[PDB]
């Protein structure tokens, strides 16, 4: 019963961590890849779909 | 003895002697001890070898997000 008491005040104190980050750089890559997928390609696509659709208002002639 | 409790006495005072030896009751002797030594060791084989009288402590880590 006295080997036991060591392992109480040890186990009751001895607490486990959760594992850490090492790759949330995927969220910075995701913000950069949304600037690419949204803004960069979105506004460039809105002038290119308009390049055709403005030629479709010219094709109405 | 068969005022039957005297056969308990018959045993019992030889418990009284044995427990009122050391280790509590001994006379089991070294031959018992080699037997012990194996199974007590053999226990450790199943069971690991360290803090069986202290607290084991542990560690926490990661490889990669594969």
From Swiss-Prot, chain A:
The modification N6-succinyllysine is found at residues 15, 22, 32. One of its GO terms (molecular function) is proton-transporting ATP synthase activity, rotational mechanism. Keywords: Acetylation, CF(0), Hydrogen ion transport, Ion transport, Membrane, Mitochondrion, Mitochondrion inner membrane, Transport. GO terms for biological process: proton motive force-driven ATP synthesis; proton motive force-driven mitochondrial ATP synthesis. The keyword Repeat does not apply. Transmembrane segments: none annotated. Signal peptide: none annotated. The modification N6-acetyllysine is found at residues 9, 15, 22, 32, 54. It is found in: Mitochondrion; Mitochondrion inner membrane. GO terms for cellular component: mitochondrial inner membrane; mitochondrion; proton-transporting ATP synthase complex. The keyword Chloroplast does not apply. Component of the ATP synthase complex composed at least of ATP5F1A/subunit alpha, ATP5F1B/subunit beta, ATP5MC1/subunit c (homooctomer), MT-ATP6/subunit a, MT-ATP8/subunit 8, ATP5ME/subunit e, ATP5MF/subunit f, ATP5MG/subunit g, ATP5MK/subunit k, ATP5MJ/subunit j, ATP5F1C/subunit gamma, ATP5F1D/subunit delta, ATP5F1E/subunit epsilon, ATP5PF/subunit F6, ATP5PB/subunit b, ATP5PD/subunit d, ATP5PO/subunit OSCP. Belongs to the ATPase d subunit family. Subunit d, of the mitochondrial membrane ATP synthase complex (F(1)F(0) ATP synthase or Complex V) that produces ATP from ADP in the presence of a proton gradient across the membrane which is generated by electron transport complexes of the respiratory chain. ATP synthase complex consist of a soluble F(1) head domain - the catalytic core - and a membrane F(1) domain - the membrane proton channel. These two domains are linked by a central stalk rotating inside the F(1) region and a stationary peripheral stalk. This is ATP synthase peripheral stalk subunit d, mitochondrial. The chain holds residues 64 to 124 of 161 of the full protein.
UniProtKB/Swiss-Prot annotation, chain B:
GO terms for biological process: proton motive force-driven ATP synthesis. GO terms for cellular component: mitochondrial inner membrane; mitochondrion; proton-transporting ATP synthase complex. It comes from the Eukaryota. Keywords: Acetylation, CF(0), Hydrogen ion transport, Ion transport, Membrane, Mitochondrion, Mitochondrion inner membrane, Phosphoprotein, Transit peptide, Transport. It is found in: Mitochondrion; Mitochondrion inner membrane. The modification N6-acetyllysine is found at residues 6, 11, 44, 49, 64. One of its GO terms (molecular function) is proton transmembrane transporter activity. The modification N6-succinyllysine is found at residues 49, 64. Subunit F6, of the mitochondrial membrane ATP synthase complex (F(1)F(0) ATP synthase or Complex V) that produces ATP from ADP in the presence of a proton gradient across the membrane which is generated by electron transport complexes of the respiratory chain. ATP synthase complex consist of a soluble F(1) head domain - the catalytic core - and a membrane F(1) domain - the membrane proton channel. These two domains are linked by a central stalk rotating inside the F(1) region and a stationary peripheral stalk. Component of the ATP synthase complex composed at least of ATP5F1A/subunit alpha, ATP5F1B/subunit beta, ATP5MC1/subunit c (homooctomer), MT-ATP6/subunit a, MT-ATP8/subunit 8, ATP5ME/subunit e, ATP5MF/subunit f, ATP5MG/subunit g, ATP5MK/subunit k, ATP5MJ/subunit j, ATP5F1C/subunit gamma, ATP5F1D/subunit delta, ATP5F1E/subunit epsilon, ATP5PF/subunit F6, ATP5PB/subunit b, ATP5PD/subunit d, ATP5PO/subunit OSCP. Belongs to the eukaryotic ATPase subunit F6 family. This is ATP synthase peripheral stalk subunit F6, mitochondrial. It comes from Bos taurus. The lineage of its organism: Eukaryota, Metazoa, Chordata, Craniata, Vertebrata. The chain holds residues 36 to 101 of 108 of the full protein.
